């Protein structure tokens, strides 16, 4: 696969009015870890995605790009 884009965290954070700093603090994470999620450089684990979804109050499915 040539796919580079797997998550849409950056978009969901924008929809919800939350910053990378907010997510970083809320989840007790390191700043670079969160940054690389948002740029699709490093993907969160599926368990982490559920934690993100809970923090943001969105269906976890919305954090992933559709392949329909």
């Amino acid at each position: 696969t040539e796919r580079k884009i797997f998550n849409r965290l950056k978009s969901v954070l924008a929809e919800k009015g939350k910053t990378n700093l907010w997510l970083t603090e809320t989840l007790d994470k390191n700043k670079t870890t969160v940054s690389k999620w948002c740029t699709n450089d490093v993907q969160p684990s599926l368990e982490t995605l559920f934690d993100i979804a809970e923090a943001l109050n969105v269906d976890v499915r919305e954090l992933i790009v559709s392949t329909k």
Copy 2:
């Protein structure tokens, strides 16, 4: 205390495919695929995308919905 994160077993059943089919299609080990199906170990998000492509399903369907 969530234990169930994926719907792989359910989607395989929907699509009429077996674990063995997935192991051969993706070149993975049986026990690895089994552990995904039983929600004992989760695949990476990238591997989830590979599984979705193999199954011709929206990757989102592989994950338990939280709303």
